[PDB]
Design a protein around this ligand. Structure first.
Ligand SMILES: [Cl-]
Ligand SMILES: [Cl-]
Ligand SMILES: [Cl-]
Ligand SMILES: [Cl-]
Ligand SMILES: [Cl-]
Ligand SMILES: [Cl-]
Ligand SMILES: [Cl-]
Ligand SMILES: [Cl-]
Ligand SMILES: [Cl-]
Ligand SMILES: [Cl-]
Lengths: 156, 156, 156, 156, 156, 156, 156, 156, 156, 156
């Protein structure tokens, strides 16, 4: 039977415990996800409180991080999502994604409406991934791909 | 000489006027950007007050929308950026991008640090684009690509 | 070509003018929507700045309300949605719906997860209606039906 | 003698303990409410800190979840209601109900005044329920019924 | 047909015009409400944007204040209520009533639940009045009576 | 010597302990205040952290609730007042008193200035009480009396 | 008959026009108050929207500043007080008195309770003045004296 | 070597421990500060987390209150100042000082600029004291003296 | 006689008018400040509403921007300072200086107390400047120098 | 493998423990950074939770502060940055840097665009230092140098 949380602090506290175990073992997110059959972004988001693992994955990652049974159970609960402490991020890495919305949010709305129509690009029928690509001018770039279904607003 | 603004309401009120003129002419953002040499996302963001157009582009779009000389001049001023009325969007279309940040912000941080290092993905050396494609299960998806330079945080 | 707005106050000022015209004519929202083919909640929401009308419906309601051509065109533009002035309503009628969320929001989350699974009930593939019924104990009751598609959250 | 609470954290802490017991026992909210004579939405809201259980229901659910005597007494206290952590939900499932108010809140106002008159639809002489319905286009929909008494505002 | 507003600034702008007319004419609220059949607190609240007047009272107050026909019409519309500019009052007179809630709000909750039960004292089925009483230690006291219907919360 | 607090959470923690003791003993606030010579609204407010009890009343209530000597001392300290968690109540019972201010707060200002003059009705030279009265139409009403000294604002 | 305001912006806009006129005439607050019989702090506060002037003073300062009849009338209304734009001042000169409260607020509470007892120092039966004194180490000091009645909180 | 703090909660927790000790010993702030050669407002503010005591004063108060060595050391640390829990006080005693700013803040600004010039009255080169004196009309008044250095703002 | 403002919108509206004049004339801030005898950062801040100009500088810049006589007088008024629209900047250029304080604010505090002692680095006995320096790894850097007097906090 | 945090409180609690260790040892920040090869501002920021230390510097500062292994490991984790408790500082020393932004933030924007172009000065390719110098008028000054790379915003 599905089980769900109503207070994010329980899963976020567990995420802090998971990160200390991870660092003591000198593990990467890529190696924790490897073998689960699940994408690294999904498994990472679950460890950080924002997705629920299926039971087999929760046991797999639980063994790798030496978690106890209550923590393996908690990773399978549907979370009360929301990773930002107080609405706007303070951390510079996270903030730049907020700034992208402050600069391009109205452009994203306008172009979605022109290409698709009235309605939204979903954050639920949705996936994202992060890739590193060489910059031809030197250094490295991240290409982050947001891929969401269009859901139309029609008249009723 | 470069010229800059300190109150966003001047360019946002210009954007409202632009959009009325666009609608009376039954124009698209794609056709407005046609012939400028510049990407639709960048041009549209300038119309909506979030970027500056080079003089030639400003004249080109200004002839298409029948703008007066002060409006063409304002399009070339560096803006006081920030398109969200009050920190969190109310509009559903814009809000889903904010929800992507509430659900995957910490994951984006974690995977950026693992793949690149300490530091940021820039929102300045940065480009974005929106493509429409079919969904293999039916309907349509948006693939939005955020492409920013990695800038490292190093000890000093 | 679809056209969209980025500042809610244009459509909200139109809504105030619509209301004054409506009052001078002693019109009801039911009679305004009559003839359009569209549900009274959807037409009323467009008048109040939260939906877009198709052209024929815009022209029809525009004739009933004596609207000018710029107003008719504005009702066809996709709005920057968000009807609450500052996040939490002050008006008692609207505030009771917010209070329903404060009392039952976590119960709605828990029972949506038990009945459907992880994911959301959509606010976009969605219809609402308000029906007046008799209260068998005396008086009248509103039965407000929120009818949204279940969109699952699945691992990837 | 009726007893009441003044700080929500006592019952919300109890709610987190209840959810952990429920998960360990792999119980559903439907099974917890069975035998009580009360609707699942009501009993679930009480477990989550937003309603008071009558003594016999408190003892029933208490035995199912192996709660101690103080927890069984706290479920009978009238709560300090308010389930949303900080005014606007961050959780997607909960946020969509908030977005329904941002899009349709003024329309609910307008139609309540047209159909009933000045006043409110109560959140106190009130009930809700959640039903699952097949969608004809594929998938499932939730039909969430809000059913409140009209209470008039009259001159004095 | 009943008519309702969705932005409070229309009626609050009206209230400022009413106050200027009232001051130029050197009228009291008591004299304005005289002849309407309605309590001074209700008529005053309507002038200040927070209640609707029946048409005969709107016409009577409109004559006294030399209002125009659109303003007499606006006074009959059901308002978007909420008189405090930004949630907590700044004005000392208004603030003391907010302070009474900061000091005694939990006591009011507790004594309402003990004397009546679970539920609320209504702000809709509700009257208030302000009376001036001599203080036996010297000076004057205000006795403000809040008189609301008890509406119970019961299981379903 | 008089002693005063600066962190509300000490007294609010004590309040929660008091309410648990009170519920275990099945006591009423009227019976706790019986024998103190003090009004039930004042005594209840002290229990809930918003007033100080004189030492004899603190020992009297402490006997009835079986409080330890540290708790009886704490009830005599002058509190850091403010019972609302975060400015606006979430609880429906408390909220309706806030809604009375949002509806009538400008009316109370205007009528206090008309009846008394510039200045305020005190919240310190002040008493409140709650009475239950039958409603002639059926049911029960609360009559809450707010009785405050008028303090004038004069030029100097 | 006393007249009062509900929107501070009318008197704050008046204040801006008063200050322009004062600057064009190169007047000081001291000379505007000289001759009224009223303290400079009280007259200045009225000009700035935070007190009401008696009619003779309003005519005197209105002649000095060349105000029109509507402005002289507005100066006599009881204001909706609160001079800070958005709760915390941005201006450095004002902010330092807020910082006094952040550093010493609990000390003021503690010393008021020690010296006087439970209750408050009034902001209504209250005067302030500002004096310039030489600093013996060099330069100048402002001695600002806040002089308020103690009003006791007593049990009832 | 001077030592500083970055989290106010350490010293505010000390303050709560100090006030419990003080109350158990039935001590006054006047007596705590006696012998220290420092003003009672300065010593009190250090106890409550808002100033640092020189080492001899720390030792001497620590003796009176029986503090442990981590607490006598902590009193000498430079605090992270800010005594108001959440920007605006809820306690009535503290709030009246905030209300003095809401009423007279712009008057204080205007009179400081006229009497001294552009710049500030310092909150750092600053002393405050509270005196109790009789009111000539009966009762008692607080005379609170804010004495700060003028620091000019001049061009560069 | 010195003159001061109390609402920032008068000077910020002026700044917008100055900026439009500047752009029409294609002037730089360096050239506007030329001839004034004042630093470019000071003069620019005055044009943007955050400092006052002496009369000869105001007349000089006024002639270069073709300002009217009331504008030239406004530039001499002491401003109600505070350039950030709503506490945290949205503009990326401005936000990076805020992010410096989120990352280094507690380090600034720590190192100021270490090197100087308890007290502050002034923002009034203060100057800043911006210099462009080549980066040896390519490109350019800004060296922004904040230079403030240390003002100690001493016991009294 | 690089490791990162997502909740600032883990490193901020570590900072508080580091500060108590430092105070017991009578250590300076300059002494703690000595021998690390890293600037005191960077090492002090790491101790306070806002930067990561390389492993050899972590071990070195850990030896000086008697830190346990988990604490040395936590200092090497990439932090969730953000040192201000709630957006605007309360502490006077911190606040003056914020005030520098409220007074000069728009001037910094204007001058960066004039000297460099559209774009930002980086807070990531960035160094800061604090230097104490004599004030030639008497006393001491801090010279705080902010040195960041200019990153241009160009059309795409
Ligand atoms: Cl979605
Ligand atoms: Cl960036
Ligand atoms: Cl949705
Ligand atoms: Cl209700
Ligand atoms: Cl109600
Ligand atoms: Cl009072
Ligand atoms: Cl008062
Ligand atoms: Cl200062
Ligand atoms: Cl300063
Ligand atoms: Cl940056």
């Amino acid at each position: 039977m599905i089980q769900s949380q109503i207070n994010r602090n329980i899963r976020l506290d567990l995420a802090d415990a998971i990160l200390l175990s991870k660092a003591k073992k000198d593990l990467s997110f890529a190696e924790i996800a490897d073998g689960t059959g699940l994408a690294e972004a999904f498994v990472t988001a679950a460890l950080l409180g924002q997705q629920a693992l299926p039971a087999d994955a929760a046991r797999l990652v639980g063994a790798k991080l030496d978690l106890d049974e209550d923590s393996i159970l908690l990773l399978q609960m549907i979370p009360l999502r929301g990773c930002i402490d107080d609405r706007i991020p303070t951390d510079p890495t996270m903030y730049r994604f907020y700034e992208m919305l402050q600069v391009y949010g109205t452009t994203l709305k306008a172009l979605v409406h022109e290409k698709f129509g009235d309605g939204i690009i979903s954050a639920i029928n949705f996936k994202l991934d992060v890739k590193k690509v060489a910059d031809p001018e030197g250094g490295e770039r991240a290409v982050i791909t947001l891929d969401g279904k269009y859901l139309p607003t029609k008249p009723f």
